[PDB]
């Protein structure tokens, strides 16, 4: 896996070059917004089970065929598995944010997931909707102005959305 620094170091090495004055500044700047990134991780994390459970409930209300007998989330075994996945996707999303690089998420979670679902008969599209619902709840939680030093978190929120968005793209 890469983190933001390490991703740059990788690319420079394949060129045999030292990181340029520009690219060091780019990283420097990402360091200066460190605190907002960590708030971003703490807040999503510190609310993970609400984010999951509410998204799961909305999804099932929206898509009853999923929990009707016969559907892919019917049976305790399967419902539990499904909740477990929502939770897993969210966990990897937070890793990506913390590291400031999508790789943890691409490599250890999304890659091959689409094929897994297809083999099982899990409707990936439905997972995507779930992932999508978690994205909104997550973002609203990172953007809440209560109890934090006011500032702009818009670029970070864009980054966070991105990670969610690729998770939804990857299953589906």
């Amino acid at each position: 896996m890469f983190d933001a620094f390490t991703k740059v170091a990788a690319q420079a090495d394949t060129r045999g070059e030292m990181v340029s004055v520009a690219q060091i500044d780019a990283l420097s700047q990402m360091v200066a917004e460190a605190n907002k990134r960590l708030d971003a991780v703490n807040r999503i994390t510190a609310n993970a089970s609400t984010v999951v459970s509410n998204a799961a409930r909305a999804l099932f209300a929206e898509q009853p065929q999923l929990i009707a007998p016969g559907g892919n989330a019917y049976a305790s075994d399967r419902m539990a598995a499904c909740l477990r996945d929502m939770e897993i996707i969210l966990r990897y999303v937070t890793y990506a944010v913390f590291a400031g690089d999508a790789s943890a998420l691409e490599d250890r979670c999304l890659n091959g997931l689409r094929e897994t679902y297809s083999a099982l008969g899990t409707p990936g599209s439905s997972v995507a909707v779930g992932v999508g619902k978690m994205k909104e709840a997550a973002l609203a939680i990172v953007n809440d102005p209560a109890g934090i030093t006011p500032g702009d978190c818009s670029a970070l929120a864009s980054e966070i959305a991105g990670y969610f968005d690729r998770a939804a793209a990857a299953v589906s």
Partner: protein
């Protein structure tokens, strides 16, 4: 790829758990050191050529035979004189990468893993490279945390090569 951030993600992932305040503390440490680290890298980059010749010449001084013996492992010709500067260049470049990443990761992966086989195969002496690194320590001219950090990596290379 040992860096504070990837190391933290890695343990969490391997225990199947969301990041806790422990990993946030790791990040804090990383981001606070980064100030010094990024500095030191810019600094080393800019003294790149002075440091490389300097070091190369240091090694030729400690080990004069390396500039007179015939044969491909030595620097009696220009070919070899070049290989040598190239390699010292590689060491210094990795040190800057370490400084940027905030861990030995990049040196671990691009240089240290397999070095023993290369040197044994091609008959290069680790003693030579230790001298080069020793020179870079004495002559980089960084102060405070940038110094203590860069030195940590220079000494780490030395330990790997001992």
């Amino acid at each position: 790829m040992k860096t504070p951030l990837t190391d933290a993600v890695s343990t969490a992932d391997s225990q199947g758990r969301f990041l806790s305040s422990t990993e946030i503390q790791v990040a804090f440490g990383r981001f606070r050191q980064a100030a010094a680290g990024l500095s030191a890298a810019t600094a080393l980059t800019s003294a790149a050529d002075a440091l490389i010749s300097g070091a190369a010449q240091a090694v030729y001084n400690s080990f004069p035979y390396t500039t007179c013996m015939q044969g491909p492992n030595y620097a009696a010709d220009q070919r070899g004189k070049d290989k040598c500067a190239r390699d010292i260049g590689y060491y210094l470049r990795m040190v800057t990468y370490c400084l940027i990443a905030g861990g030995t990761g990049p040196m671990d992966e691009y240089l240290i893993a397999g070095i023993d086989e290369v040197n044994r195969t091609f008959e290069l002496s680790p003693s030579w490279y230790i001298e080069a690194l020793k020179y870079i320590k004495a002559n980089h001219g960084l102060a405070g945390d940038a110094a203590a950090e860069a030195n940590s990596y220079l000494d780490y290379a030395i330990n790997a090569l001992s």
